[PDB]
Amino acid sequence: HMSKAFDLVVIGAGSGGLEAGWNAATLYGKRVAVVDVQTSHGPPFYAALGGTCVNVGCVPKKLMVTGAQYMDHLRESAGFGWEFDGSSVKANWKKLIAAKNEAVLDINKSYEGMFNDTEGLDFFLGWGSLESKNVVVVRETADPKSAVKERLQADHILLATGSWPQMPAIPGIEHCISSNEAFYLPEPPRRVLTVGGGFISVEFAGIFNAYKPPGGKVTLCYRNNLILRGFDETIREEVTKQLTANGIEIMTNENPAKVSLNTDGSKHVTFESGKTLDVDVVMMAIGRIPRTNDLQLGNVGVKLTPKGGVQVDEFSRTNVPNIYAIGDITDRLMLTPVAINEGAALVDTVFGNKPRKTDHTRVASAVFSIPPIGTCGLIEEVAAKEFEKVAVYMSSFTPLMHNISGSKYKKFVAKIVTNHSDGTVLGVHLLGDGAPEIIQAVGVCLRLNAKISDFYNTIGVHPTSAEELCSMRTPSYYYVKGEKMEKLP
Amino acid sequence: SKAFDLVVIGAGSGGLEAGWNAATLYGKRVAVVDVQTSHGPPFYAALGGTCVNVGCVPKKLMVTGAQYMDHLRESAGFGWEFDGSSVKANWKKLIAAKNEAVLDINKSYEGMFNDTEGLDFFLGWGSLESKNVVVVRETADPKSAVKERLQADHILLATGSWPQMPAIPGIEHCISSNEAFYLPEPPRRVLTVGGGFISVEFAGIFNAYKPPGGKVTLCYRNNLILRGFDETIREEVTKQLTANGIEIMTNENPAKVSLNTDGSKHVTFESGKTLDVDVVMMAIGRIPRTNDLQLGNVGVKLTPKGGVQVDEFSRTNVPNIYAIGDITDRLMLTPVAINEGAALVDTVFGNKPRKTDHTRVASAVFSIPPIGTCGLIEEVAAKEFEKVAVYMSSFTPLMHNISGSKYKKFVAKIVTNHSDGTVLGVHLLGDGAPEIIQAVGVCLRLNAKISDFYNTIGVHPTSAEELCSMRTPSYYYVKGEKMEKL
Ligand SMILES: Cc1cc2nc3c(=O)[nH]c(=O)nc-3n(C[C@H](O)[C@H](O)[C@H](O)COP(=O)(O)OP(=O)(O)OC[C@H]3O[C@@H](n4cnc5c(N)ncnc54)[C@H](O)[C@@H]3O)c2cc1C
Ligand SMILES: Cc1cc2nc3c(=O)[nH]c(=O)nc-3n(C[C@H](O)[C@H](O)[C@H](O)COP(=O)(O)OP(=O)(O)OC[C@H]3O[C@@H](n4cnc5c(N)ncnc54)[C@H](O)[C@@H]3O)c2cc1C
Ligand SMILES: C[C@H]1C[C@@H]2CNC[C@@H]2N1C(=O)C(C)(C)C
Ligand SMILES: [Br-]
Ligand SMILES: [Br-]
Ligand SMILES: [Br-]
Ligand SMILES: [Br-]
Ligand code: NA
Q: Which positions fall inside the Pyridine nucleotide-disulphide oxidoreductase dimerisation domain (chain B) (predicted)?
């Protein structure tokens, strides 16, 4: 049996690696090999063909947030005249998970079909690692002593193995799970603690809160004062109030010290503060780390950053000439469309002789919390460090449908941050139903260097939440040499 | 007799922007006249305008209400269980809630007048007595009792529009959108007449709230509803309305209506077909509301269509008389009317001449599912440019394979000047389309090109990200003819 030769070998058939592989083969005629550990979603390895987003990430989680939103629709319909037996209402978690599994498996099979079909785009099942500068080895397991399935010769090698949930070293960590297992729980937990203040912990808290059985309770804990570091502070505070208003307990300044099993098998969580909490599930969502350890990068000398990701330049090159890295393995912005963009830019540069580098600024993104967040660009405290004078335009209003729905607590917030010197928009931050869909074209605006007056000159679509972005023209306050103030001196 | 810098006839969308801006931004003395202080019969429009009282605001609420019919059914695919036969749609509760929400806005507009210097409200019917005098009478009758005589350095006409009713025997047995907002009972069988957004939106409303055994029909005299919108989208929304139980009668037009012994209506079409319904709602158009203004006293000119004639700065033929909003018979939208008012006040009372841009205006249809659009449809662009590209995406989103509403295709279309890639128009159909389109209106003011959309990183997973993944045209127009290749 002979080794096989390729122009590009890709390790990891995920968001970035599939984009790079498809494009190299179909746009430029190269011969491409792509490696992944599993052909379809779920245990044992969770991620598989298609990547983390497709299998245990954006796609399943957005289906489950959608299912969770119906708790709000069913209740809110009554303000509009809808009547039904409220006592008969049941959230069937098994049906949600079965429907999600089926949709995900369909994408798995479609990816498998593409490979079986496409000229010069080949898939290989196993664990890829770097043997030498121009040879990828595929093994049966992650252990480098497991059996060799293939050796793939490669002029160019792309590292795109993604990331993995981080678990803290606490007594009883064996009793906790991560988001990977959360996607496959047989029954919805009566009491669940989600640990962490980031988007995964928040999104999952909203899912569990809608499907909990009668008498259930969702608790989110975070070790610092305010959840969702990195997002707009006004939105960080309002999303907390609205999560609380939907029945979620948010324990800030609290962090688990240990977990033990009660005699009945529930989990007994003890915090550093000495507080205790009994729950049926502890889901850790405290961060995600790049998957480097299994690539045997020492064999060829690929440098990692102090933080732990593969070091790359603006064109995704490592310190080894023909070896590249994109996506979550670079431990920077962990979003699917960034990985896809890096994959497309790398292939255009290397094989298309039209060079191009990914713009990591002004990336639009969303949090699918209930209610959701949309954001593009800088938060005000960051902009205030870089610009002499920053203006902040802010509109916070209850939409009219929530005058009737009951959920008067569902304020919509729109904020625009500018360079007050010339009116250039530095960032837009939104909270409320529709915010993820609204922000997308805001991203095109910022790539076109929109000023606040381009937003204000635009005639609104009425009645919408989004029209409030186009009717703001006096700042609510300023930052002058970093000092917040209602008025300019 | 009382003196004023500006007299505004009509306390509506454009008339209230212009009034308040004149008073608080330039310290002028302002009087605003309207026939009614809150919504509903007898005059329907009132303080706040058509949009507030019998337009965008109540219809958005009621459309929101009609969407729960789909939410209740779709929730099953995501595991939601409940007693489906226990479900009923209480129309009176909807109307009652809508009435209170509208009244709250009526009252807030009242306090605004009581709290603002140089801004007074007058109840009654305003008309032009002489070139600098506005009269307020008790009724629309030009002989009713004079309540006030306001003299104005400047007069602003902003009385909006009113439903058009065709001259067919039995028209008096038909209603318009005005009365639909106040029907005591949701109609069991109803015919909505017209292809425009009002017919289409109310059809979706009645369809959700109809009692058991009910049926909504929409008829339209030509072949395809929603003239003026994208043609792919007119065809799709027809299909998706039909999938949800609404009968679309194209190429049919009522010829007479008559009263049945049980109180229902018998409709005869020009084709000879007949239909018995409980309600016939005419939605065939809205016409400028000029008749009660006594424009003949001062000689304000009307275009042949009936709009007050204006220049780019809202000036009539009579100096110091202006007209904005639906009475100029142009784009009949609330944000256009507001923009027109503010530009007028900036020009007249500030040192800031300003005209409204009537191009690239984003707007929406709150049909189920809804439409969002900005700029040119492909066949209009094909008459203005030699080379036009059309980029298109249309599929059922994943969630609606699970929900079971698999007919719910999302459609996104981008129209470019292929010569330089400049985006001329964007057209959307599907949940969220009215919200997605807003910032697209901003992109078109920066002369975005298709490559600016495609080079922007997408938000995943959303419907909106489809707009940033279209690289290759689906087809083209060259010298006005449609073809798939260049
Ligand atoms: C719960 C959750 C929700 C998320 N939601 C969103 C969201 O809403 N929007 C968004 O933009 N992003 C979201 N993300 C992030 C998104 O999933 C990632 O940013 C994206 O998948 C990273 O793409 P990538 O190409 O770097 O790697 P991945 O998509 O992770 O693909 C890497 C692949 O490599 C394989 N692999 C690993 N090691 C090896 C090896 N040695 N040999 C062979 N194959 C290997 C893995 O099995 C995997 O398939 C979410 C993530 C999580 C965990
Ligand atoms: C059913 C319906 C739904 C709509 N939905 C939308 C939507 O979603 N989005 C959108 O942008 N547009 C919508 N519109 C259009 C919008 O309502 C109008 O474009 C807007 O109200 C026009 O504003 P205007 O300033 O011209 O006058 P209006 O807002 O109509 O105000 C005119 C006012 O003048 C008063 N008046 C009339 N005659 C006299 C007189 N002789 N003396 C004194 N006062 C008088 C009236 O009572 C009224 O209050 C809708 C319209 C309708 C009918
Ligand atoms: C509640 C506010 C703000 C919402 C966002 N834009 C539409 C909604 N509103 C209004 O249109 C009124 C007329 C009530 C001001
Ligand atoms: Br269940
Ligand atoms: Br401005
Ligand atoms: Br018609
Ligand atoms: Br037609
Ligand atoms: Na609204």
A: 361-467
B360-471: CATH topology: Enolase-like; domain 1 (3.30.390)
A12 lines ligand 1 (CB under 6 A): yes
Restricting to A residues 299-328, those with a Cβ less than 8 Å away from any Cβ of B are: none
Tell me whether residue A219 is annotated as binding: no
Which residue in the block uniquely carries the two structure tokens 């999303």? A239
Domain B1-163+285-359 matches domain B164-284 at the CATH topology level: yes
Structural domain boundaries of chain B?
Answer: 1-163+285-359, 164-284, 360-471
The token pair that represents A375 in the structure block:
């954001």
**Could you tell me which CATH class the domain A166-286 is placed in?**
alpha beta
Q: Could you say which residues from 237 to 296 on chain B have a Cβ atom under 8 Å away from some Cβ of chain A?
A: none
Q: Does A467 touch chain B (CB under 8 A)?
A: yes
Chain-chain contact of A461 with B75 (C-beta, under 8 angstroms)? no
Q: Does any ligand 3 atom lie closer than 6 A to the CB of residue A397?
A: yes
Interchain CB contact of B209 with A (< 8 Å): yes
Q: Does residue B323's CB lie within 6 angstroms of at least one atom of ligand 2?
A: no
Ligand-binding site membership of B59 (annotated): yes
| Cα B10 to middle of ligand 8, angstroms | 24
Tell me if chain A has a CB within 8 Å of the CB of B142. Answer: no
CB B341 within 8 A of CB B21: yes
Architecture of domain A362-473: 2-Layer Sandwich (3.30)
Min Cα separation B96/chain A (Å): 9
The topology under which CATH files domain B164-284 is FAD/NAD(P)-binding domain (3.50.50)
Interstrand relation of B146-157 and B321-323 (parallel, antiparallel or unpaired)? parallel
Looking at beta carbons, which residues of chain A come within 8 Å of B204? none
Per-residue burial over B231-270, b if 16 or more Cβ lie within 10 Å, else e, is ebbbebbbebbeebebebbeebbbbebeeeeeebbbbbbe
CA of B406 to the centre of ligand 4 (A): 25
Experimentally, how was this structure solved?
X-ray
B65: nearest CA partner in chain A: A80
Q: What's the distance, Cα to Cα, between the start and end of chain A in Å?
A: 78
Q: Is residue B128 a contact partner of residue B296, using CB atoms and an 8 Å limit?
A: no
Quote the Cα angle for A308-A176-A334, to 5°: 35
The architecture that CATH gives domain B1-163+285-359 is 3-Layer(bba) Sandwich (3.50)
Using H for helix, E for strand and C for coil, what is the string for chain A? CCCEEEEEEEECCCHHHHHHHHHHHHHHCCCEEEEECCCCCECCCECCCCHHHHHHCHHHHHHHHHHHHHHHHHHHHHHHCEECCHHHCEECHHHHHHHHHHHHHHHHHHHHHHHHHCCCEEEEECEEEEEECCEEEEECCCCCCCCEEEEEEEEEEEECCCEEECCCCCCCHHHCECHHHHCCCCCCCCEEEEECCCHHHHHHHHHHHHHCCCCCEEEEEECCCCCCCCCCHHHHHHHHHHHHHCCCEEEECCCEEEEEECCCCCEEEEECCCCEEEECEEEECCCEEECCHHHCHHHCCCCECCCCCECCCCCCECCCCCEEECHHHHCCCCCHHHHHHHHHHHHHHHHCCCCCCCCCCCCEEEECCCCCEEEEECCHHHHHHHCCEEEEEEEEECCCHHHHHCCCCCCEEEEEEEECCCCEEEEEEEECCCHHHHHHHHHHHHHCCCEHHHHHHCCCCCCCCHHHHHCCCCCCEEEECCEEECCCC
Q: How many CB atoms lie within 10 A of CB A361?
A: 10
Judge whether A41 counts as a catalytic residue.
Answer: no
Q: Which CATH class is domain A2-165+287-361?
A: alpha beta
Nearest CA to ligand 3 atom 10: A463
* SS3 annotation, A263-283: CCCCEEEEECCCCEEEECEEE
